[PDB]
Amino acid sequence: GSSGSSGGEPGTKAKKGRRSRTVFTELQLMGLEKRFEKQKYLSTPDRIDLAESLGLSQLQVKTWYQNRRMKWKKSGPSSG
């Protein structure tokens, strides 16, 4: 036989942007939800094309998305 032994990451990090400043307009949000929904994660160029269509910043999609994912996911350790 032959199976892995140990594959640990060389080093990772996480950042938090809990800021109640960024605001999206009903219009912008509408589009953001449409895209994300269709494609949980956009591509390098794609994300750009969108930010240009709605007038948002590439960062928006990136961040906004990640944040959305959280809710999108589902954790059920024990219900009861």
Coordinates of all heavy atoms in Angstrom, one line a residue:
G1 N 0.8 -1.2 0.0 CA 0.0 0.0 0.0 C 0.8 1.3 0.0 O 2.1 1.2 0.1
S2 N 0.2 2.4 -0.2 CA 0.9 3.7 -0.2 C -0.1 4.8 -0.1 O -0.8 5.2 -1.0 CB 1.7 3.8 -1.5 OG 0.9 3.6 -2.6
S3 N -0.1 5.5 1.1 CA -1.0 6.6 1.3 C -0.3 7.8 2.0 O 0.8 7.6 2.6 CB -2.2 6.2 2.3 OG -1.7 6.0 3.6
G4 N -0.8 9.0 1.8 CA -0.2 10.2 2.4 C 0.2 10.0 3.8 O -0.3 9.1 4.5
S5 N 1.1 10.8 4.3 CA 1.6 10.7 5.7 C 1.2 12.0 6.4 O 0.6 11.9 7.5 CB 3.1 10.6 5.7 OG 3.8 11.6 5.0
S6 N 1.5 13.2 5.9 CA 1.2 14.4 6.5 C 1.4 15.6 5.6 O 2.5 15.8 5.0 CB 2.1 14.7 7.8 OG 1.5 15.5 8.7
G7 N 0.3 16.3 5.3 CA 0.3 17.4 4.4 C -0.2 18.7 5.0 O -1.4 19.1 4.8
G8 N 0.6 19.4 5.8 CA 0.3 20.6 6.4 C 0.7 21.8 5.7 O 1.7 21.8 5.0
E9 N -0.1 22.9 5.8 CA 0.2 24.1 5.1 C 1.4 24.8 5.6 O 1.7 24.8 6.8 CB -1.0 25.1 5.1 CG -2.0 24.9 4.0 CD -2.5 23.5 3.9 OE1 -1.7 22.6 3.5 OE2 -3.7 23.2 4.2
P10 N 2.2 25.4 4.7 CA 3.4 26.1 5.1 C 3.2 27.4 5.9 O 4.0 27.9 6.6 CB 4.1 26.5 3.8 CG 3.0 26.5 2.8 CD 2.0 25.5 3.3
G11 N 1.9 27.9 5.9 CA 1.5 29.1 6.6 C 0.4 29.8 5.9 O 0.4 30.2 4.7
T12 N -0.7 30.0 6.7 CA -1.9 30.7 6.2 C -2.2 31.9 7.1 O -1.7 32.1 8.2 CB -3.1 29.8 6.1 OG1 -3.3 29.1 7.3 CG2 -2.9 28.8 5.0
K13 N -3.1 32.8 6.6 CA -3.6 33.9 7.3 C -5.0 34.4 6.9 O -5.4 34.1 5.8 CB -2.6 35.1 7.1 CG -2.6 35.7 5.7 CD -1.7 34.8 4.7 CE -1.4 35.6 3.5 NZ -1.1 34.7 2.3
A14 N -5.7 35.0 7.8 CA -7.1 35.4 7.5 C -7.2 36.9 7.9 O -6.8 37.3 9.0 CB -8.1 34.5 8.2
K15 N -7.9 37.6 7.1 CA -8.2 39.1 7.4 C -9.7 39.3 7.6 O -10.5 38.6 7.0 CB -7.7 39.9 6.2 CG -8.3 39.6 4.9 CD -8.0 40.7 3.9 CE -6.5 40.6 3.4 NZ -6.2 39.4 2.6
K16 N -10.0 40.3 8.4 CA -11.4 40.7 8.6 C -11.7 42.1 8.3 O -10.9 43.0 8.6 CB -11.8 40.4 10.1 CG -13.2 40.6 10.4 CD -13.5 40.7 11.9 CE -13.3 39.3 12.6 NZ -13.7 39.3 14.0
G17 N -12.8 42.4 7.6 CA -13.1 43.7 7.2 C -14.5 44.1 7.7 O -15.3 44.7 7.0
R18 N -14.7 43.9 9.0 CA -16.0 44.2 9.6 C -16.2 45.7 9.7 O -16.0 46.3 10.7 CB -16.1 43.6 11.0 CG -17.5 43.7 11.6 CD -18.4 42.6 11.1 NE -19.8 43.0 11.1 CZ -20.8 42.1 10.8 NH1 -20.5 40.9 10.4 NH2 -22.0 42.6 10.8
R19 N -16.6 46.3 8.6 CA -16.8 47.8 8.5 C -18.2 48.1 8.0 O -18.6 47.7 6.9 CB -15.7 48.4 7.6 CG -14.4 48.6 8.3 CD -13.4 49.3 7.3 NE -12.9 48.4 6.3 CZ -12.0 48.8 5.4 NH1 -11.5 50.0 5.4 NH2 -11.6 48.0 4.4
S20 N -18.9 48.9 8.8 CA -20.3 49.3 8.4 C -20.3 50.6 7.6 O -21.0 51.5 7.9 CB -21.1 49.4 9.7 OG -20.6 50.4 10.6
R21 N -19.4 50.6 6.6 CA -19.3 51.8 5.8 C -19.8 51.5 4.3 O -20.7 52.1 3.8 CB -17.9 52.3 5.7 CG -17.5 53.1 7.0 CD -16.4 54.1 6.7 NE -15.1 53.4 6.4 CZ -14.0 54.0 6.1 NH1 -13.9 55.3 6.0 NH2 -12.9 53.3 5.9
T22 N -19.2 50.5 3.7 CA -19.5 50.1 2.4 C -21.0 50.0 2.2 O -21.7 49.2 2.9 CB -18.9 48.8 2.0 OG1 -19.3 47.7 2.9 CG2 -17.3 48.9 2.0
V23 N -21.6 50.7 1.2 CA -23.0 50.6 1.0 C -23.3 50.4 -0.5 O -22.7 50.9 -1.4 CB -23.7 51.9 1.4 CG1 -23.7 52.1 2.9 CG2 -23.0 53.1 0.7
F24 N -24.3 49.5 -0.8 CA -24.6 49.1 -2.2 C -26.0 49.6 -2.5 O -26.9 49.5 -1.7 CB -24.5 47.6 -2.4 CG -23.1 47.1 -2.3 CD1 -22.6 46.5 -1.1 CD2 -22.3 47.2 -3.4 CE1 -21.3 46.1 -1.0 CE2 -21.0 46.7 -3.3 CZ -20.5 46.1 -2.1
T25 N -26.2 50.1 -3.7 CA -27.5 50.6 -4.1 C -28.4 49.5 -4.6 O -27.9 48.5 -5.2 CB -27.4 51.6 -5.2 OG1 -26.8 51.0 -6.4 CG2 -26.6 52.8 -4.8
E26 N -29.7 49.6 -4.3 CA -30.7 48.5 -4.7 C -30.3 48.0 -6.1 O -30.4 46.7 -6.3 CB -32.1 49.1 -4.8 CG -32.7 49.3 -3.4 CD -33.0 48.0 -2.7 OE1 -33.9 47.2 -3.2 OE2 -32.2 47.7 -1.7
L27 N -29.9 48.8 -7.0 CA -29.5 48.4 -8.4 C -28.2 47.5 -8.3 O -28.2 46.4 -8.8 CB -29.2 49.6 -9.2 CG -29.3 49.4 -10.8 CD1 -30.7 49.4 -11.3 CD2 -28.4 50.4 -11.5
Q28 N -27.2 48.1 -7.7 CA -25.9 47.3 -7.6 C -26.1 46.0 -7.0 O -25.7 44.9 -7.5 CB -24.9 48.1 -6.8 CG -24.4 49.4 -7.4 CD -23.7 50.3 -6.5 OE1 -23.9 50.3 -5.3 NE2 -22.9 51.2 -7.1
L29 N -26.8 45.9 -5.8 CA -27.1 44.7 -5.1 C -27.8 43.7 -6.0 O -27.4 42.5 -6.1 CB -27.9 45.0 -3.8 CG -27.1 45.4 -2.6 CD1 -28.1 45.7 -1.4 CD2 -26.2 44.2 -2.2
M30 N -28.8 44.2 -6.7 CA -29.6 43.3 -7.6 C -28.7 42.6 -8.5 O -28.8 41.4 -8.7 CB -30.6 44.2 -8.4 CG -31.3 43.4 -9.5 SD -32.9 44.1 -9.9 CE -32.6 44.8 -11.5
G31 N -27.7 43.3 -9.1 CA -26.8 42.6 -10.0 C -25.8 41.7 -9.3 O -25.6 40.6 -9.8
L32 N -25.3 42.2 -8.2 CA -24.4 41.4 -7.4 C -25.0 40.0 -7.0 O -24.3 39.0 -7.1 CB -23.9 42.1 -6.1 CG -22.9 43.2 -6.3 CD1 -22.8 44.1 -5.1 CD2 -21.5 42.6 -6.7
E33 N -26.2 40.0 -6.6 CA -26.9 38.8 -6.2 C -27.1 37.9 -7.4 O -27.0 36.7 -7.3 CB -28.3 39.1 -5.6 CG -28.1 39.8 -4.2 CD -29.5 40.1 -3.6 OE1 -30.1 41.1 -3.8 OE2 -29.9 39.2 -2.8
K34 N -27.4 38.5 -8.6 CA -27.7 37.8 -9.8 C -26.4 37.0 -10.2 O -26.5 35.8 -10.5 CB -28.1 38.7 -10.9 CG -29.0 38.1 -12.0 CD -30.4 37.8 -11.4 CE -31.3 39.1 -11.5 NZ -32.7 38.8 -11.6
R35 N -25.3 37.7 -10.3 CA -24.0 37.1 -10.7 C -23.6 36.0 -9.7 O -23.6 34.8 -10.1 CB -22.9 38.2 -10.8 CG -23.0 39.0 -12.1 CD -22.3 38.3 -13.2 NE -21.7 39.2 -14.2 CZ -22.4 39.8 -15.1 NH1 -23.7 39.5 -15.3 NH2 -21.8 40.6 -16.0
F36 N -23.4 36.4 -8.5 CA -23.0 35.4 -7.4 C -23.8 34.2 -7.5 O -23.3 33.1 -7.7 CB -23.1 36.1 -6.1 CG -22.5 35.2 -5.0 CD1 -21.5 35.7 -4.2 CD2 -23.1 34.0 -4.7 CE1 -20.9 34.9 -3.2 CE2 -22.6 33.2 -3.6 CZ -21.5 33.7 -2.9
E37 N -25.1 34.3 -7.4 CA -26.0 33.2 -7.5 C -25.7 32.3 -8.6 O -25.5 31.1 -8.4 CB -27.5 33.7 -7.6 CG -28.1 34.2 -6.3 CD -28.5 33.0 -5.4 OE1 -29.3 32.2 -5.9 OE2 -28.0 32.9 -4.3
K38 N -25.6 32.8 -9.8 CA -25.3 32.0 -11.0 C -23.9 31.4 -10.8 O -23.8 30.2 -11.1 CB -25.2 32.9 -12.3 CG -26.6 33.5 -12.6 CD -26.5 34.5 -13.7 CE -27.9 34.8 -14.3 NZ -28.4 33.6 -15.1
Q39 N -22.9 32.1 -10.4 CA -21.5 31.6 -10.2 C -21.0 32.0 -8.9 O -20.5 33.1 -8.7 CB -20.6 32.1 -11.3 CG -19.4 31.2 -11.6 CD -18.8 31.5 -13.0 OE1 -18.7 30.6 -13.8 NE2 -18.3 32.7 -13.2
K40 N -21.1 31.1 -7.9 CA -20.6 31.3 -6.6 C -19.3 32.1 -6.6 O -19.1 33.1 -5.8 CB -20.4 30.0 -5.8 CG -21.6 29.5 -5.1 CD -22.8 29.4 -6.0 CE -23.9 28.5 -5.4 NZ -25.1 28.4 -6.3
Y41 N -18.4 31.7 -7.5 CA -17.1 32.4 -7.6 C -16.8 32.8 -9.0 O -16.8 31.9 -9.9 CB -16.0 31.5 -7.1 CG -16.4 30.7 -5.9 CD1 -16.2 29.3 -5.9 CD2 -17.0 31.2 -4.8 CE1 -16.6 28.5 -4.8 CE2 -17.4 30.5 -3.7 CZ -17.2 29.1 -3.7 OH -17.5 28.3 -2.7
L42 N -16.6 34.1 -9.3 CA -16.4 34.6 -10.6 C -14.9 34.4 -11.0 O -14.1 34.0 -10.1 CB -16.7 36.1 -10.7 CG -18.2 36.4 -10.3 CD1 -18.3 37.9 -10.1 CD2 -19.1 36.0 -11.4
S43 N -14.6 34.7 -12.2 CA -13.2 34.5 -12.7 C -12.4 35.8 -12.6 O -13.0 36.9 -12.3 CB -13.2 34.0 -14.2 OG -13.9 32.8 -14.3
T44 N -11.1 35.8 -12.9 CA -10.3 37.0 -12.8 C -10.9 38.1 -13.7 O -11.2 39.2 -13.2 CB -8.9 36.7 -13.3 OG1 -8.1 36.3 -12.2 CG2 -8.3 37.9 -14.0
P45 N -11.0 37.9 -15.0 CA -11.6 38.8 -15.9 C -13.1 39.1 -15.7 O -13.5 40.2 -15.7 CB -11.3 38.2 -17.3 CG -11.3 36.7 -17.0 CD -10.7 36.6 -15.6
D46 N -13.8 38.0 -15.5 CA -15.2 38.1 -15.3 C -15.6 39.2 -14.2 O -16.2 40.2 -14.5 CB -15.8 36.8 -14.9 CG -16.2 35.9 -16.1 OD1 -15.4 35.7 -17.0 OD2 -17.4 35.4 -16.1
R47 N -15.1 38.9 -13.0 CA -15.3 39.9 -11.9 C -15.1 41.3 -12.4 O -15.8 42.2 -11.9 CB -14.3 39.6 -10.8 CG -14.4 40.5 -9.6 CD -13.5 40.1 -8.4 NE -13.9 38.8 -7.9 CZ -13.4 37.7 -8.4 NH1 -12.6 37.7 -9.5 NH2 -13.8 36.5 -7.9
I48 N -14.2 41.5 -13.3 CA -13.9 42.9 -13.8 C -15.0 43.3 -14.7 O -15.6 44.4 -14.4 CB -12.6 42.9 -14.6 CG1 -11.4 42.4 -13.7 CG2 -12.3 44.3 -15.1 CD1 -10.1 42.3 -14.5
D49 N -15.4 42.5 -15.7 CA -16.4 42.9 -16.6 C -17.7 43.4 -15.9 O -18.3 44.3 -16.2 CB -16.8 41.7 -17.5 CG -17.5 42.1 -18.8 OD1 -17.2 43.2 -19.3 OD2 -18.3 41.3 -19.3
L50 N -18.0 42.7 -14.8 CA -19.2 43.0 -14.0 C -19.0 44.3 -13.3 O -19.8 45.3 -13.5 CB -19.4 41.9 -12.9 CG -20.2 42.3 -11.7 CD1 -21.7 42.5 -12.1 CD2 -20.1 41.3 -10.6
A51 N -17.9 44.5 -12.5 CA -17.6 45.7 -11.8 C -17.8 46.9 -12.8 O -18.0 48.1 -12.3 CB -16.2 45.7 -11.2
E52 N -17.6 46.7 -14.1 CA -17.7 47.7 -15.1 C -19.1 47.9 -15.5 O -19.6 49.0 -15.9 CB -16.8 47.4 -16.3 CG -15.4 47.9 -16.2 CD -14.8 48.2 -17.5 OE1 -15.1 47.5 -18.5 OE2 -14.0 49.2 -17.6
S53 N -19.9 46.8 -15.5 CA -21.3 46.9 -15.9 C -22.2 47.6 -14.8 O -23.0 48.4 -15.2 CB -21.9 45.5 -16.1 OG -21.6 45.0 -17.4
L54 N -21.9 47.3 -13.6 CA -22.7 47.9 -12.5 C -22.0 49.1 -12.0 O -22.6 50.0 -11.4 CB -22.8 46.9 -11.3 CG -23.6 45.6 -11.6 CD1 -23.4 44.5 -10.6 CD2 -25.1 46.0 -11.6
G55 N -20.7 49.2 -12.2 CA -19.9 50.4 -11.8 C -19.3 50.2 -10.5 O -18.9 51.2 -9.8
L56 N -19.1 49.0 -10.1 CA -18.5 48.7 -8.8 C -17.0 48.4 -8.9 O -16.5 48.4 -10.0 CB -19.2 47.4 -8.1 CG -20.7 47.6 -7.7 CD1 -21.3 46.3 -7.3 CD2 -20.8 48.6 -6.6
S57 N -16.3 48.2 -7.8 CA -14.9 48.0 -7.8 C -14.6 46.5 -7.6 O -15.2 45.8 -6.8 CB -14.2 48.7 -6.7 OG -14.2 50.1 -7.0
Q58 N -13.7 46.0 -8.5 CA -13.3 44.5 -8.4 C -13.3 44.0 -7.0 O -13.8 42.9 -6.7 CB -12.0 44.3 -9.0 CG -11.9 44.8 -10.5 CD -10.5 44.9 -11.0 OE1 -10.0 46.1 -11.1 NE2 -9.8 43.8 -11.3
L59 N -12.8 44.8 -6.1 CA -12.7 44.4 -4.7 C -14.1 44.1 -4.1 O -14.3 43.1 -3.5 CB -12.1 45.6 -3.8 CG -12.0 45.3 -2.3 CD1 -11.1 44.2 -2.0 CD2 -11.6 46.6 -1.6
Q60 N -15.1 45.0 -4.5 CA -16.5 44.7 -4.0 C -16.9 43.3 -4.2 O -17.2 42.6 -3.2 CB -17.4 45.7 -4.8 CG -17.2 47.1 -4.5 CD -17.9 47.5 -3.2 OE1 -17.5 47.0 -2.1 NE2 -18.8 48.5 -3.2
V61 N -16.9 42.8 -5.4 CA -17.3 41.5 -5.8 C -16.5 40.5 -4.9 O -17.1 39.6 -4.2 CB -17.1 41.1 -7.2 CG1 -17.7 39.8 -7.6 CG2 -17.7 42.2 -8.1
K62 N -15.2 40.6 -4.9 CA -14.4 39.7 -4.2 C -14.8 39.6 -2.7 O -15.2 38.6 -2.2 CB -12.9 40.2 -4.2 CG -11.9 39.1 -4.1 CD -10.5 39.6 -3.9 CE -10.3 40.0 -2.4 NZ -9.2 40.9 -2.2
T63 N -14.8 40.8 -2.0 CA -15.2 40.8 -0.6 C -16.7 40.4 -0.5 O -17.0 39.4 0.1 CB -15.0 42.2 0.0 OG1 -13.6 42.6 -0.2 CG2 -15.4 42.3 1.4
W64 N -17.6 41.2 -1.0 CA -19.0 41.0 -1.0 C -19.3 39.5 -1.1 O -20.1 38.9 -0.3 CB -19.7 41.7 -2.1 CG -21.2 41.7 -1.9 CD1 -22.0 42.4 -1.0 CD2 -22.2 40.9 -2.6 NE1 -23.3 42.2 -1.1 CE2 -23.5 41.2 -2.1 CE3 -22.1 40.0 -3.6 CZ2 -24.6 40.6 -2.6 CZ3 -23.2 39.4 -4.1 CH2 -24.5 39.7 -3.6
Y65 N -18.6 38.8 -2.0 CA -18.8 37.4 -2.3 C -18.5 36.6 -1.0 O -19.3 36.0 -0.4 CB -17.9 36.9 -3.4 CG -18.6 37.0 -4.8 CD1 -19.3 38.2 -5.2 CD2 -18.7 35.9 -5.6 CE1 -19.9 38.3 -6.4 CE2 -19.3 36.0 -6.9 CZ -19.9 37.2 -7.2 OH -20.6 37.2 -8.5
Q66 N -17.2 36.6 -0.7 CA -16.7 35.8 0.5 C -17.7 35.9 1.6 O -18.1 34.9 2.2 CB -15.3 36.4 0.9 CG -14.2 35.7 0.2 CD -12.8 36.4 0.6 OE1 -12.2 36.0 1.6 NE2 -12.4 37.3 -0.2
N67 N -18.1 37.2 2.0 CA -19.1 37.4 3.0 C -20.3 36.6 2.8 O -20.9 36.0 3.7 CB -19.4 38.9 3.2 CG -18.2 39.7 3.8 OD1 -17.5 39.1 4.6 ND2 -18.1 40.9 3.4
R68 N -20.8 36.7 1.6 CA -22.1 35.9 1.2 C -21.9 34.4 1.4 O -22.8 33.8 2.0 CB -22.4 36.2 -0.3 CG -23.0 37.6 -0.5 CD -24.5 37.7 -0.1 NE -24.9 39.1 0.1 CZ -26.2 39.4 0.3 NH1 -27.1 38.4 0.5 NH2 -26.6 40.7 0.4
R69 N -20.8 33.9 0.9 CA -20.5 32.5 1.1 C -20.9 32.0 2.5 O -21.7 31.0 2.6 CB -19.0 32.2 0.8 CG -18.6 32.4 -0.6 CD -17.1 32.2 -0.8 NE -16.8 30.8 -0.7 CZ -15.5 30.4 -0.8 NH1 -14.5 31.2 -1.0 NH2 -15.3 29.1 -0.8
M70 N -20.4 32.6 3.5 CA -20.6 32.3 4.9 C -22.1 31.8 5.0 O -22.4 30.7 5.4 CB -20.4 33.4 5.8 CG -18.9 33.8 6.0 SD -18.1 32.8 7.3 CE -16.4 32.7 6.7
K71 N -23.0 32.7 4.8 CA -24.5 32.4 4.9 C -24.8 31.3 3.9 O -25.6 30.3 4.3 CB -25.3 33.6 4.5 CG -26.8 33.4 4.7 CD -27.6 34.4 3.8 CE -29.1 34.3 4.2 NZ -29.7 33.1 3.5
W72 N -24.3 31.3 2.7 CA -24.6 30.3 1.7 C -24.4 28.9 2.3 O -25.2 28.0 2.1 CB -23.8 30.5 0.4 CG -23.6 29.3 -0.4 CD1 -24.6 28.6 -1.1 CD2 -22.4 28.6 -0.6 NE1 -24.1 27.5 -1.7 CE2 -22.7 27.5 -1.5 CE3 -21.1 28.8 -0.2 CZ2 -21.7 26.6 -1.9 CZ3 -20.1 27.9 -0.6 CH2 -20.5 26.8 -1.5
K73 N -23.2 28.8 3.0 CA -22.9 27.5 3.6 C -23.9 27.0 4.6 O -24.8 27.8 4.9 CB -21.5 27.6 4.2 CG -20.3 27.6 3.2 CD -19.1 27.1 3.8 CE -18.4 28.1 4.8 NZ -19.0 28.0 6.1
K74 N -23.7 25.8 5.1 CA -24.6 25.3 6.1 C -23.9 24.3 7.0 O -23.3 23.4 6.6 CB -25.8 24.6 5.4 CG -27.0 24.5 6.3 CD -28.0 25.7 6.2 CE -28.7 25.7 4.9 NZ -29.9 24.7 5.0
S75 N -24.0 24.6 8.3 CA -23.4 23.7 9.3 C -24.4 23.1 10.3 O -25.1 23.8 11.0 CB -22.3 24.5 10.1 OG -21.1 24.6 9.4
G76 N -24.5 21.8 10.3 CA -25.4 21.1 11.2 C -24.8 20.0 12.0 O -24.8 18.8 11.7
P77 N -24.1 20.5 13.1 CA -23.5 19.6 14.1 C -24.4 18.7 14.8 O -24.2 17.5 15.0 CB -22.7 20.5 15.0 CG -23.5 21.8 15.0 CD -24.1 21.9 13.6
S78 N -25.5 19.3 15.3 CA -26.5 18.6 16.0 C -27.8 19.4 16.3 O -27.7 20.4 17.2 CB -26.0 18.0 17.4 OG -27.0 17.4 18.2
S79 N -28.9 19.2 15.6 CA -30.1 20.0 15.8 C -31.0 19.3 16.8 O -31.5 18.2 16.5 CB -30.8 20.2 14.5 OG -31.9 21.0 14.6
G80 N -31.2 19.9 17.9 CA -32.1 19.3 18.9 C -31.8 19.8 20.3 O -30.6 20.1 20.6

